[PDB]
Amino acid sequence: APLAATASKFLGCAYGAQQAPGFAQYWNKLTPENGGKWGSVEAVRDQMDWSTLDAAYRFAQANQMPFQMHVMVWGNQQPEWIKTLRPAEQRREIEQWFAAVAQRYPDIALLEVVNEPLNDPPSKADTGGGNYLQALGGNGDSGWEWVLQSFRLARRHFPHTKLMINDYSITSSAQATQKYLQIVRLLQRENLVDAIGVQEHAFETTPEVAVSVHRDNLDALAATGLPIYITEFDLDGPTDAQQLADYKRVFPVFWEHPAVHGITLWGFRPGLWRDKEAAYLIRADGTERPALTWLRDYVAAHP
Numbered sequence: 411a412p413l414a415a416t417a418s419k420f421l422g423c424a425y426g427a428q429q430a431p432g433f434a435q436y437w438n439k440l441t442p443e444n445g446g447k448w449g450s451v452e453a454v455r456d457q458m459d460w461s462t463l464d465a466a467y468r469f470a471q472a473n474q475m476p477f478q479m480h481v482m483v484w485g486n487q488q489p490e491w492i493k494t495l496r497p498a499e500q501r502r503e504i505e506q507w508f509a510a511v512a513q514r515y516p517d518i519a520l521l522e523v524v525n526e527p528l529n530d531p532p533s534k535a536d537t538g539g540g541n542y543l544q545a546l547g548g549n550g551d552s553g554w555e556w557v558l559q560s561f562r563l564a565r566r567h568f569p570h571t572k573l574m575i576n577d578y579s580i581t582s583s584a585q586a587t588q589k590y591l592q593i594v595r596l597l598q599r600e601n602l603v604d605a606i607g608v609q610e611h612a613f614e615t616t617p618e619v620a621v622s623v624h625r626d627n628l629d630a631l632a633a634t635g636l637p638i639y640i641t642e643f644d645l646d647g648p649t650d651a652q653q654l655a656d657y658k659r660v661f662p663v664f665w666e667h668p669a670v671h672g673i674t675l676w677g678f679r680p681g682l683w684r685d686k687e688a689a690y691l692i693r694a695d696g697t698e699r700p701a702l703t704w705l706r707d708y709v710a711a712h713p
């Protein structure tokens with residue numbers, strides 16, 4: 411049984427080749443780690459490789475767990491061919507991408523429309539930068555036109571799907587939260603957003619910032635009336651003791667917040683994003699680290 415089997419909110423994980431073994435024995439929600447990124451699907455223009463995204467979607471369906479589509483608009487891992495197209499043609503490509511996903515995947519629980527607006531807009535012309543910001547109206551009069559246009563597209567193509575914005579290094583500072591809240595509010599004005607995502611990777615939750623700051627910022631975001639999801643949670647493990655201590659300090663702050671409707675870990679086995687920082691909860695030999703032992707017991711005691 412997954413850790414959150416009897417909980418009031420889900421505890422999911424990023425899904426990928428390395429995260430596959432034993433997934434459904436631990437987690438009860440998923441996000442495709444890489445397969446739902448536009449550059450993963452349409453690396454070569456107008457040929458769609460759905461295989462990895464199909465796997466994540468079908469696995470979610472078969473194991474009867476919520477599926478978060480990750481991600482429609484982002485500033486990396488975008489198709490290489492799109493960055494040199496005129497905005498007029500880029501926009502048509504974006505429209506087609508939205509339609510393609512909407513058509514193929516009717517049972518999306520949460521659609522991550524835009525990831526990292528404060529950190530990585532699609533404005534770079536490097537390999538996977540996309541460089542399509544102007545195709546979405548650029549900054550415009552509000553400063554966030556491209557985010558608005560992305561969610562307008564989402565409402566059009568996914569008229570009955572919960573729409574989510576996602577970003578990192580938000581709750582770690584009042585200033586970032588205030589910046590992010592502005593984006594959420596602009597989206598709320600057009601009733602375009604249904605959920606607020608914050609990643610909470612290891613770099614966002616170091617002991618340099620008090621837990622009270624994260625908590626106050628969760629409260630600030632909660633005042634929108636929108637549910638909050640922690641989307642890409644991980645904690646480094648240079649030692650077992652540090653990872654354990656950090657899990658005890660950090661995880662309950664988010665798990666116990668009434669506005670938080672679920673947490674997704676960004677991997678749990680070696681080969682996850684923060685592999686060099688040893689953020690995995692299970693070792694190379696398959697044994698469970700102390701942080702995971704605690705997490706199981708903690709979640710069981712906090713339903």
Ligand SMILES: O[C@@H]1[C@@H](O)[C@H](O)OC[C@H]1O
Nearest residue numbers: 424443444676682683684
């Ligand atoms: O695989 C990595 C993924 O885990 C992260 O979320 O985005 C960057 C990718 O390289």
Ligand SMILES: [Ca+2]
Nearest residue numbers: 455456503506
């Ligand atoms: Ca296309």
